[PDB]
Ligand binder design. Structure first.
Ligand SMILES: N#CCC(O)CC#N
Ligand SMILES: N#CCC(O)CC#N
Ligand SMILES: N#CCC(O)CC#N
Ligand SMILES: N#CCC(O)CC#N
Ligand SMILES: N#CCC(O)CC#N
Lengths: 224, 224, 224, 225
């Protein structure tokens, strides 16, 4: 097993990419703590880790409505703030909580399921895009700092990937979605959740200790 | 006069890069509304703009203490939130407020004084770096949306530039800061505030209409 | 004049972006040496610079047929070699020929007219794309080495800009071209040659001394 | 069983650069590796390597040339400049162009290029070399999305600070000067072993990476971050 003997902490395990992570990571021998705690609440992250015990890998799995099609002028205070409360501030909270034990053992792995909208313009997703950009920046600024304690932190800039929040069955069925994907995605298809978790498995494994603070675009060529 | 006839709204005119902006923009024939409002408060942004009246150019000039040297574990909730409350959330409030008149005229200019820390890793500046990454994301996401209305939105990714909040006289006088800069900046010197303002000037002028949602690194070669 | 008292060497001055560089640069006070030498020949570049005498600015102006639509399998040896012989190998020859006198004075400016196909995937332009990437790497690698001597080397990553080689009047006059351009270019128009030269002007001027080895995307937001 | 079970891999210049770790890692994982030693700077050579090789599922484009560390722009003469391109740029297209027809026939293929982080960010004192690596990166960026329409993956490993004889031979890395540069410039604070580089290439060559198209993955301990 490529994660044999590892204990993995997965945030919001029922949302976004959690289901495929559990399935892939367990079949590679990991013990996956599938947490369901709302990490927008101050203090919650410190407790999840406390109750978790020994963590080898943190899979920071956060998602929020992109509000596709909402314009800049329609991006009101609540919508803007909710993007940050939901995927930005919790990211630092939960990473801060795991790092002490990582630093104790001079070893650790963090994988962030982010978005290729943090790499390049995605139309109609303003507040959301800026929040993923901030996630991306967290990995860019933390990666090399944590690398000094032999901790890897990396960012999956995913897009066109099966999940409820962004590519739900109703959306991907329309003629309009299929024409737009064909124009914009060179590979011409969506990724499966499993393919996403296979990249994360690499980034969570000890096969990837030399990858630090990087954004790997998981997008079928979209941002190329 | 390269800004002849233009009116310019400058945020936090006394902080960060405001002084050099007034100097250079006024020399090129612009009226500069030098604002000192605390755009942290909901509603302030809209009222600066109503009072300002006609605006051809918004210079979004925001700054927060980088808290140099503060590590990830020492980056507490207050410090983290302050970075976003000070330079991220207000940026969208003020850009949302001027865009309506830009869209009526099908013309507009937005210049964001940002950070090269939004482009690449800057040691000991975690919270701040993620916040600058949010600003960069805002320019990347908004730029192409606004450009359909002939509105230019761009990002100056500056570093190693004279200002009080990051390169104040006491910090840059040490013999050993000079050695560090000399290793990290290929040009081997700090930029003057004025040089930064001459880049903002180009981006604010109608000489730069084809520049859309870009991050121009203004850093002596640091991130190259 | 913003180039008052400057002498500018412009390669292939009757091709690509030369005409507009002469007009804009002469308007700003510069003497423009409009060279037509075939710099694909060894020894030519050194002779040109010897004839030119005192140079403050080099505008590396090279272009080659992109063979739009030719695929990887039909990109034969001769087509591949020609792209490098035309725009890659000559670039090093003329910059190497100019740098000695810049190093004596510890001052110089090099502006490269490049392509946004050096930044992002451009359909059906394989050999040409890789040659522009090479140009971009030359700016990226030389930039910081030349900046030690207070010399600026920068790259204009242009696209959707009027010129005979890539956007000649016939090609851009059809309704099909305009509809594709409207989809791919957020600003929704081509740039004028003059607008391109106004960015070169900024990068050739002493207002841009802090810009080192950078690629500035001049593409209506295409690559954003 | 193996992550490349049943796959036939064509590896160029198998004794140079990252070739040896590639053989070892890929074969541990069930691959049959065709370890080519042909000089692909000769026109027509790439086509013959592919024909003589039979069925190919993965091409590992493994090319290196002397970086000429420390050689200045003014010292970069015609022959040095030309040699960097003749050695790692021109053959890259020759060998990919030669293998793609059978990939396109089967609507399936993998290409992994061992490149350089010098193709991503400024690396001191390696001018001609850096621009040749930049051209490799551009090849992947431009070919990547084109080949992806035929279900072929082309990706670029932008490696630095990684075991090899061309760029980290023993005399170079023994000096105090080099050890202090690395500690300052490499967040992880060490060099990679060739095995670790090959494990990334393993991922990119496997069918676990079908969704990675024309990308540059930085394998540099954080140097370019
Ligand atoms: N899948 C996924 C991430 C989402 O950001 C894509 C978009 N827009
Ligand atoms: N000058 C300036 C902006 C600051 O972000 C640089 C740093 N660190
Ligand atoms: N104009 C121009 C540069 C050209 O390379 C754009 C394309 N394709
Ligand atoms: N190729 C290569 C590297 C070599 O030229 C330097 C040594 N030892
Ligand atoms: N500079 C440098 C090293 C890189 O070019 C390849 C490796 N390893």
């Amino acid at each position: 097993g490529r994660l044999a003997g590892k204990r993995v902490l997965l945030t919001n395990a029922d949302a976004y990419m959690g289901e495929a992570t559990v399935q892939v990571f367990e079949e590679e021998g990991a013990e996956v703590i599938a947490d369901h705690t709302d990490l927008t609440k101050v203090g919650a992250a410190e407790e999840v880790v406390e109750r978790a015990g020994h963590i080898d890998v943190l899979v920071a799995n956060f998602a929020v409505d992109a509000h596709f099609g909402v314009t800049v002028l329609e991006t009101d205070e609540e919508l803007w703030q909710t993007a940050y409360e939901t995927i930005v501030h919790p990211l630092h909270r939960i990473c801060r909580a795991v790092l002490p034990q990582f630093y104790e053992r001079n070893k650790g792995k963090i994988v962030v399921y982010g978005s290729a909208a943090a790499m390049r313009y995605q139309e109609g997703a303003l507040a959301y895009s800026t929040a993923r950009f901030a996630q991306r920046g967290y990995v860019t600024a933390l990666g090399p700092e944590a690398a000094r304690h032999n901790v890897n932190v990396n960012f999956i800039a995913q897009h066109w990937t099966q999940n409820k929040e962004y590519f739900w069955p109703e959306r991907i069925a329309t003629d309009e979605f299929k024409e737009d994907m064909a124009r914009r995605v060179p590979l011409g298809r969506l990724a499966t959740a499993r393919e996403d978790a296979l990249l994360a498995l690499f980034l969570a494994s000890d096969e990837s200790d030399f990858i630090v603070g990087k954004s790997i675009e998981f997008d079928g060529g979209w941002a190329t």
